[PDB]
Each structure stands twice: as C-alpha cells, then as structure tokens.
Design a binder for this molecule. Structure first.
Ligand SMILES: [Zn+2]
Ligand SMILES: [Zn+2]
Ligand SMILES: [Zn+2]
Lengths: 114, 65, 44, 266
C-alpha cells in the first residue's frame, strides 16, 4: 500500500547520480561520498580495501537508514594524496583480486569429477 | 492447500519432492526422518517445509462445482 | 448476459426479465460467468 | 595464480564445497551476498489467466508459477524488459510459455512444471526450459485437477535480480565458516560447565591446527581461510553461480570506477 517499489533498490531514480562527492567540513583533506542504490555488499568491501592503503588515515561507511538503498563513505588521506585516487586504487585492487579468484576457481573446477 | 514450491528459509525447491516423500513413506514403509533424509533435505528448514505440510487440496477436490 | 448453475454443470444465457431458475434442474442458485477480458498477474 | 586461492573439496551438479584462501573477510561476505541476491535469472514475471476452474486461486497459482526454476544459462545474452525498446515484452527480453491442463481421467489429474510449453522464439539461446531434477521426470507439482476442472494460462518470463524477488534466486543455502577453532576469538562461547564438551566440533576442524594452551593469544592474526559450500537451485550451475557472482561484484565495482571516471567532466 505504502511500500516502495522493489527496483528502487538498484535502479537509479530521476536525476539521482550514482556517486555524490562532498567536501567534508570537519577535518581537512577529507571527503564524504554518497553511494546510491548500493548496500553493505559494496560498502564493506571498499571500506575494508581502503584500510589496506597505508596512506589512508580514515575510512568508514554507514547506511543511515535500511529503508533506503544508499550508503555514505567517508575517506581521509594524507596531504598530497587525493582521496579519489585512494578509492580508485581500492576499486582496481578489488577487481584484480576478483579476477584472479575467478581464474583460480576455474582452473580448480577443471580438475574435478561428478 | 498444496505443497509449497520452494522452502521459505533458504529457497530450495521442495515442490517436486512431495509425491516422492509419500512413496518413501507408504511404499518403502520408512519413517518420516529417513524419507526426508533420502530426498536430500539435510537442513531442518526444508525438512520442516515437507514434514510440517498438510495437503488440504485433496479435501478441496472432493467438491463437484 | 449468461450465467451458470451452482449444483450442476450448465450454461444458461437468460438475461433480464428471466432470472431463476435453471434449465432441467430445479434449484435457484445461479452464479455468473468469468469475464472474457483477461487479467494479468504479477507472479510475485 | 598470484592472489586468492581456491581448493575444491567436493564437487557435484548441485553443490560446491571449497576453501577460499588468502582473502579479506569483507570480500568473502560480499561474494556471498552477490551470490545470494545479485545474480540475474529468468523466471515467470507475468501470468495471463484465461480459464481457471481449479481449487487454487488465480494469483495463488501465479505465485508458485513465479517460483518455478527456469533455465538461465544464456541469460546474459537476454535483456531486461526495462531496457528493451519494445512494447511491453518481446523475444529479445522475455520468454513466453503456455500452460494448458484439463481433468481427463476419474483419478486426480496432476499439473506439473513439465506441462509448461515454450512458445516464444528462443532463437538459439538456451533459456526458458523448466528445470527438472525429479526422478520420474515430472518436476515441480503446480496444481491438481478433478474430473472436469480446467487450467489454461500463459506465462511471460523476464530477466530479474533476486534482490527484487526471491524467485530469481540462483542459489539456496550458502554454507560459510571461518576459523573453526575460535583462535581469532570473534565469539565468546556460552556454557554451563565445560566450553568444549558442550559445543559440537566442526568438520572444518580437520583442515586446521588446534591451539596449544602453552601458546598465548595471537592478537595480530586476521581471517584468511574460509570454508564455503554453495548450493544451486538448478537454474544456473554451481560453478557458474560462483563465477557469475564474482563477475557481478567485479562489474558493479567497475561501474563505480566508471562513475568516478565520469565525474571528471566539466
Ligand atoms: Zn530451507
Ligand atoms: Zn441446474
Ligand atoms: Zn523486449
């Protein structure tokens, strides 16, 4: 009756952009990025992959409300390091690990029976 | 009513397992636990899904209209 | 329009100024037939 | 290869029991989530009921029709109905299959999933065919007809994500367990007398070395070894479930990366 459509969990609305980059006003050289139509599946992974980068001071994601499929990711890096590059490096690292995992699983599957 | 097509909890297909369950019960004269075990229902949620079910459609088919 | 009986399989087409009862039956319980304009269902 | 490792312990048509090595917890969890909800699948989305003199209600039948496992092998070369430039649905996005059953014999006439007949043009793509892992070869029991009861309807199946409805769920239960000895101490065991005798011992204990009481707690250890068992429903093979899970996660990361590439526009 008042329940929202299901596709509003992954389909972007009217004018809604996928990422919203905002200059964090708290601490210098920090940023808060709004991910639309995404959940913990992406947030937790990216945040955990940002903490691997030792040039990243702060990195934390949160879902302000379970009703809506969106989450905010705050990133703070050292001076001389634009956080977008940290996000990009994190993402590419994720993609590489996943690709390697796919190749490995395939090669391991090609050796099985039944 | 009729046997639920898939298990609520996980999502395993248990709609094709009803008649086979009945056969394992009356034809092979097994108990419910072993019958459920043979049908590949290891988790107790699906095991529940079949064991707990009551086929009411057989009583519904008793009407002529 | 057309109507079908309750306790027997028939297919009466008696419109207004007719009503009850049925054709070769004896009971007055009459149900109405399903619409020709089909309705869709979201299998969810 | 060079990164994360896989060790297939058991392998069959329905299940894959393997060990994930050299991976972060969040990646294993995310992989599990994607495998559960974010993998594309073909299932009945629309039902057009012509005649229905069965016991079950219309949408009652439509519902369990929706849950029927359909072939989703070449689902990737099928398209979302919301993307296709057609009116409502076509052959490039949807698979239409009819159902015509009628009570014949005096005995109860069963209506299975095998009675579904593909009508729309598949044009080569392996898709739409209802999965039958049944021994007799019948499949999912859809309905039951009496002597003169008829069920005639038409199903339109569309590509969907399990995040939108659990009917598009390619997998069922995914087993997931790390550190069978609680050496990371992520769990404080509840007990009445003894902590070890009360709590059952996991199978996956066979693949790791027990802790020595002479050894202190390892506070600098993380989670590397994971024990997973992925079970498919039939719509998509297990190996393809985990692989397309991986590729889906990868693709939706690449979409964020691409978005970052796009936000540099004036
Ligand atoms: Zn279950
Ligand atoms: Zn009559
Ligand atoms: Zn189309």
């Amino acid at each position: 009756m008042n329940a929202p459509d299901r596709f509003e969990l992954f389909l972007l609305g009217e004018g809604e952009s996928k990422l919203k980059i905002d200059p964090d006003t708290k601490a210098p050289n920090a940023v808060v990025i709004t991910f639309e139509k995404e959940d913990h599946t992406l947030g937790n992974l990216i945040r955990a992959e940002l903490l691997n980068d030792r040039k990243v001071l702060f990195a934390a994601y949160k879902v302000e409300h379970p009703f809506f499929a969106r989450f905010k990711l705050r990133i703070q890096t050292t001076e001389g390091y634009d956080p977008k590059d940290a996000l990009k490096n994190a993402c590419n690292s994720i993609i590489n690990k996943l690709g390697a995992l796919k190749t490995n699983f395939e090669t391991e599957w090609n050796l099985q029976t039944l | 009513m009729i046997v639920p097509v898939r298990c609520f909890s996980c999502g395993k297909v248990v709609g094709d397992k009803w008649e086979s369950y009945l056969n394992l019960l009356q034809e092979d004269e097994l108990d419910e636990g072993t019958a459920l075990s043979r049908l590949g229902l290891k988790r107790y949620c699906c095991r529940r899904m079949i064991l707990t079910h009551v086929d009411l459609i057989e009583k519904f088919l008793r009407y002529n209209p | 329009l057309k109507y079908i009986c309750a306790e027997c399989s028939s297919k009466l087409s008696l419109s207004r100024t007719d009503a009850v009862r049925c054709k070769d039956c004896g009971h007055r319980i009459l149900l109405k037939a399903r619409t020709k304009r089909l309705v869709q269902f979201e299998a969810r | 290869e060079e990164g994360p490792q896989v060790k297939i312990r058991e392998a069959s048509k329905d299940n894959v029991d393997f060990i994930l090595s050299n991976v972060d917890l969040a990646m294993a969890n995310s992989l599990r989530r994607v495998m559960i909800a974010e993998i594309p699948t073909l299932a009945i989305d629309s039902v057009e009921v012509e005649t229905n003199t069965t016991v079950l209600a219309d949408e009652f039948i439509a519902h369990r029709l929706g849950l029927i496992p359909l072939q989703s092998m070449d689902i990737e070369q099928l398209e979302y109905s919301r993307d296709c430039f057609c009116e409502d649905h076509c052959d490039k996005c949807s698979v239409v299959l009819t159902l015509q059953a009628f009570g014949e014999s005096e005995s109860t006439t069963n209506v299975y999933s095998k009675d579904l007949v593909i009508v729309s043009n598949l044009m080569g793509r392996n898709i739409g065919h209802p999965i039958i892992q049944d021994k007799e070869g019948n499949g999912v029991l859809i309905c039951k007809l009496r002597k003169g009861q008829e069920l005639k309807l038409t199903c339109v199946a569309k590509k969907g994500i399990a995040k939108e409805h659990a009917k598009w769920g390619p997998a069922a239960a995914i087993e997931f367990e790390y550190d069978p000895w609680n050496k990371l101490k992520h769990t404080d065991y509840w007990y009445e007398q003894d902590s070890a005798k009360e709590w059952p011992q996991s199978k996956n204990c066979e693949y790791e070395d027990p802790p020595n009481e002479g050894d202190p707690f390892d506070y600098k250890a993380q989670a590397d070894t994971f024990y997973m068992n992925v079970e498919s429903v039939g719509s998509i093979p297990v190996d393809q479930v985990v692989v397309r899970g991986i590729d889906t996660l990868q693709k939706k990361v690449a979409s964020i990366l691409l978005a970052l590439t796009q936000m540099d526009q004036d």
